[PDB]
Amino acid sequence: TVRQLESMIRLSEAMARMHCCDEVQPKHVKEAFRLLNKSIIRVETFSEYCRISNLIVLHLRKVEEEEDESALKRSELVNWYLKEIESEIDSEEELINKKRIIEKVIHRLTHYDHVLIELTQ
Amino acid sequence: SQVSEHSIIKDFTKQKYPEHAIHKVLQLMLRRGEIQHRMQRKVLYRLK
Amino acid sequence: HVSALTQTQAVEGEIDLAKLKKFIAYCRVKCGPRLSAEAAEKLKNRYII
Amino acid sequence: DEDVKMITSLSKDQQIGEKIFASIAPSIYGHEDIKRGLALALFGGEPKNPGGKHKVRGDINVLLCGDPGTAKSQFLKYIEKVSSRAIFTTGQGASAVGLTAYVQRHPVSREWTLEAGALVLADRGVCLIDEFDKMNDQDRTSIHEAMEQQSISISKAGIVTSLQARCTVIAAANPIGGRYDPSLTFSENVDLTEPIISRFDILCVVRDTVDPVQDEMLARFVVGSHVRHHPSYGVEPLPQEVLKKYIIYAKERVHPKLNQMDQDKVAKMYSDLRKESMATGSIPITVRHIESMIRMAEAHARIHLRDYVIEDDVNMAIRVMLESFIDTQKFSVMRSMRKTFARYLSFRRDNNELLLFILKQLVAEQVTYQRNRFGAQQDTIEVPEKDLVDKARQINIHNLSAFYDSELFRMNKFSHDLKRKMILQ
Ligand SMILES: Nc1ncnc2c1ncn2[C@@H]1O[C@H](COP(=O)(O)OP(=O)(O)OP(=O)(O)O)[C@@H](O)[C@H]1O
Ligand SMILES: [Mg+2]
Numbered sequence: 001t002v003r004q005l006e007s008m009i010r011l012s013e014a015m016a017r018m019h020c021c022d023e024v025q026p027k028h029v030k031e032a033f034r035l036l037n038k039s040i041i042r043v044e045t046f047s048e049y050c051r052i053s054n055l056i057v058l059h060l061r062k063v064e065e066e067e068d069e070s071a072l073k074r075s076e077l078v079n080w081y082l083k084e085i086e087s088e089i090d091s092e093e094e095l096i097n098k099k100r101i102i103e104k105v106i107h108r109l110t111h112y113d114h115v116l117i118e119l120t121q
Numbered sequence: 122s123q124v125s126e127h128s129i130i131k132d133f134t135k136q137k138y139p140e141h142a143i144h145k146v147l148q149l150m151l152r153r154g155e156i157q158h159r160m161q162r163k164v165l166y167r168l169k
Numbered sequence: 170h171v172s173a174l175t176q177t178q179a180v181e182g183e184i185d186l187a188k189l190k191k192f193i194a195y196c197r198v199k200c201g202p203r204l205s206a207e208a209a210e211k212l213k214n215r216y217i218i
Numbered sequence: 219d220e221d222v223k224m225i226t227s228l229s230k231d232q233q234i235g236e237k238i239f240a241s242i243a244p245s246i247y248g249h250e251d252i253k254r255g256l257a258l259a260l261f262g263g264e265p266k267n268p269g270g271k272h273k274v275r276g277d278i279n280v281l282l283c284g285d286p287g288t289a290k291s292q293f294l295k296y297i298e299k300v301s302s303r304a305i306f307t308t309g310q311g312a313s314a315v316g317l318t319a320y321v322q323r324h325p326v327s328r329e330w331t332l333e334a335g336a337l338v339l340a341d342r343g344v345c346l347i348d349e350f351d352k353m354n355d356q357d358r359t360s361i362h363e364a365m366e367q368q369s370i371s372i373s374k375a376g377i378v379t380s381l382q383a384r385c386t387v388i389a390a391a392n393p394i395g396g397r398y399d400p401s402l403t404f405s406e407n408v409d410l411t412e413p414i415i416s417r418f419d420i421l422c423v424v425r426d427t428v429d430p431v432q433d434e435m436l437a438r439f440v441v442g443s444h445v446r447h448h449p450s451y452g453v454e455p456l457p458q459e460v461l462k463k464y465i466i467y468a469k470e471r472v473h474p475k476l477n478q479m480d481q482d483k484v485a486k487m488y489s490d491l492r493k494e495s496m497a498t499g500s501i502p503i504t505v506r507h508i509e510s511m512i513r514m515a516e517a518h519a520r521i522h523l524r525d526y527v528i529e530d531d532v533n534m535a536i537r538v539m540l541e542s543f544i545d546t547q548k549f550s551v552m553r554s555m556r557k558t559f560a561r562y563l564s565f566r567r568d569n570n571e572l573l574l575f576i577l578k579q580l581v582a583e584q585v586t587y588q589r590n591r592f593g594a595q596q597d598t599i600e601v602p603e604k605d606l607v608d609k610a611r612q613i614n615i616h617n618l619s620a621f622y623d624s625e626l627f628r629m630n631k632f633s634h635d636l637k638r639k640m641i642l643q
Contacts, residue, residue: 001286001287001426002287002289002436002437002440003286003287005437005440005441006440009441009444051590051591051593054586054590055587055590055591058583058586058587058590062583
């Protein structure tokens with residue numbers, strides 16, 4: 001938040017006081033930025049699963065919002081994602097492995113996480 | 122699964138129940154959240 | 170909201186608040202009634218039903 | 219003497235209302251809606267009591283709920299500075315002024331005194347409460363009694379009294395989890411109860427969201443304030459003393475009359491609002507909101523020194539009440555209501571602002587897609603003009619050249635390229 005900005009200014013002033021310089025200069029700003037970043041620690045538990053889920057949600061909600069017409073199905077979603085990846089996979093083995101992975105991820109999202117809804121024909 | 126509101130109205134009026142009761146029941150289910158509208162309000166679907 | 174600014178005469182036969190207060194106090198202090206047997210039996214029958 | 223003439227002359231100006239709206243809180247950037255609401259809260263309305271039976275207040279209470287770092291307390295500080303009679307207190311503890319009346323020997327003067335709470339001391343004034351959620355049981359009970367009955371009862375040490383608490387309440391608070399959840403209602407996000415929330419006429423929600431341009435501007439203002447204070451839309455806001463004099467004169471000598479209200483439109487709109495609230499199936503509207511609208515209308519009529527209420531004030535109060543009601547709903551209900559009621563919410567609005575909102579939504583969607591797929595942002599952001607045109611057509615807007623030439627387009631550092639029919643940021 002803005003409190004971090006004020007803390008950065010205070011740390012810059014502290015660095016200037018330490019080095020007895022008469023003005024705050026970019027070296028002190030860089031040092032305060034470095035220290036404040038190093039103090040922050042990231043939570044460790046996953047990123048790929050979240051990214052895939054977010055992309056799927058974005059696609060489905062764009063489909064819902066853009067059209068009052070009918071929507072797509074699970075197979076259509078899988079085919080669309082594979083078509084988008086087409087330029088990123090070079091061989092059939094990686095393609096089939098990623099297809100299995102995305103199918104399992106979609107099953108987990110629909111059944112376990114309840115994020116996505118499934119309907120019959 | 123999805124059901125059209127017209128189908129429910131026809132089914133219950135053939136049973137000769139009033140339409141206002143069906144509307145109120147649908148509104149209460151909407152409040153509870155079991156029933157949701159599709160992109161067009163003609164057809165509803167069931168959640169939990 | 171419109172009529173609150175001009176006239177406090179919403180209904181023709183309102184009892185004034187001071188008059189209503191004094192009348193309620195008067196009736197409460199003056200007398201106290203009790204039931205009648207003919208009405209009592211009907212009340213009993215209705216309560217049982 | 220001449221000050222009255224100056225006040226009348228300023229009233230003669232056709233855009234005095236916007237001047238007053240922009241005159242509030244010079245040191246806070248953004249939150250224009252909050253300042254507009256605080257304008258009505260400061261100017262107030264008019265109590266009505268037909269006979270001695272039906273009392274209706276004219277004080278417009280304000281509640282703010284915000285994520286940390288949104289500067290909720292600065293608004294209260296400014297209001298205390300401006301208001302002639304304003305009391306400030308905090309619910310966390312160790313406040314200079316308490317929130318409950320008690321009888322005690324004063325530590326300094328050593329005399330037996332009856333010290334009433336902050337609510338009693340602010341007769342015909344403003345009471346400000348910070349950290350609204352941290353309050354204990356006694357403070358909540360006293361606040362509920364003072365807001366609903368507008369009087370405080372004391373039975374202590376052989377003293378039985380009732381004291382008047384005709385005051386306007388402005389409060390600030392934080393959500394339960396420390397961050398606002400758009401998927402939950404306002405009541406589920408706040409530690410307070412529904413009866414307490416129902417008392418407030420205006421509810422404001424301040425949600426922190428990463429906007430690079432807005433963050434850049436806020437940081438620029440903060441650093442500029444820090445550098446300046448080292449020891450070594452609105453045309454022009456009014457002076458603070460002039461604003462004080464105008465407020466005093468309007469409160470003393472302006473009493474707008476409702477002799478020109480239009481009941482047909484109000485009744486139809488109320489019926490439609492209730493109908494669609496029941497259609498969505500959550501949080502239906504009630505008659506109380508209409509009352510607030512009327513009060514707000516009166517406040518607006520007090521701003522222009524109008525002695526009679528006209529349709530402009532009614533429509534502005536309608537817009538404010540509708541915004542407050544819609545903002546408390548969850549995602550889907552809020553979106554549906556916003557889409558359906560675009561007719562009323564567009565009163566005196568700016569089309570350029572709506573187009574900027576559309577552009578920002580599209581930019582956010584593109585940035586989110588880029589971050590999710592690539593794993594990192596790209597150096598440029600681009601968007602086709604066709605999508606913007608289609609959405610404007612959906613909102614019934616067919617020309618965008620003025621938007622391209624508008625100052626809002628340049629302020630957000632947008633550019634339009636005809637060589638590719640694209641918008642670049
Ligand atoms: N729009 C803004 N303009 C100027 N200063 C701002 C703005 N937003 C935040 N700040 C600054 O952020 C700092 C945060 O402190 P502040 O007391 O204002 O927070 P708060 O919103 O009351 O928070 P809390 O929820 O913790 O009570 C202040 O120094 C304030 O000046
Ligand atoms: Mg604070």
